[PDB]
């Protein structure tokens, strides 16, 4: 079974700063199989604010410059695994 070894963590960042959400899976799953969401909206590959990466077991969602409207619930979903945490923008 696919497991999440390391779950997302809540993050609080100042406006303009970088935020990142990461998780680690039990096996290497290509980035194409993962879906990230902010407040229920799927993150798109041409979103100028958010970057999605994967390296082996390690998946990440990066926000280079946080703004207040980015705040809310981050979801990661891959196969049957789901995780969530919260972005707070100070």
Residue numbers in the entry: 3 to 92
The article reads:
Titin is the largest protein in nature extending from the Z-disk to the M-band, and interacts with a number of sarcomeric and signalling proteins. Obscurin and titin also interact at the Z-disk, through Ig58/Ig59 of obscurin and the titin ZIg9/ZIg10. The Ig59 domain is only a part of the titin binding region; both obscurin Ig58 and Ig59 domains and both titin ZIg9 and ZIg10 domains are necessary for this interaction at the Z-disk.
The resulting structure shows beta sheets extending from Glu 4436 to Lys 4439 (strand A), Ala 4441 to Arg 4444 (strand A’), Ala 4445 to Thr 4454 (strand B), Ser 4465 to Ile 4469 (strand C), Trp 4480 to Asp 4485 (stand D), His 4488 to Leu 4494 (strand E), Gly 4502 to Ala 4507 (stand F), and Ala 4513 to Leu 4520 (strand G). Overall, the structure forms a typical Ig-like fold. Independently, the NMR solution structure of human obscurin Ig59 was solved with greater than 12 restraints per residue.
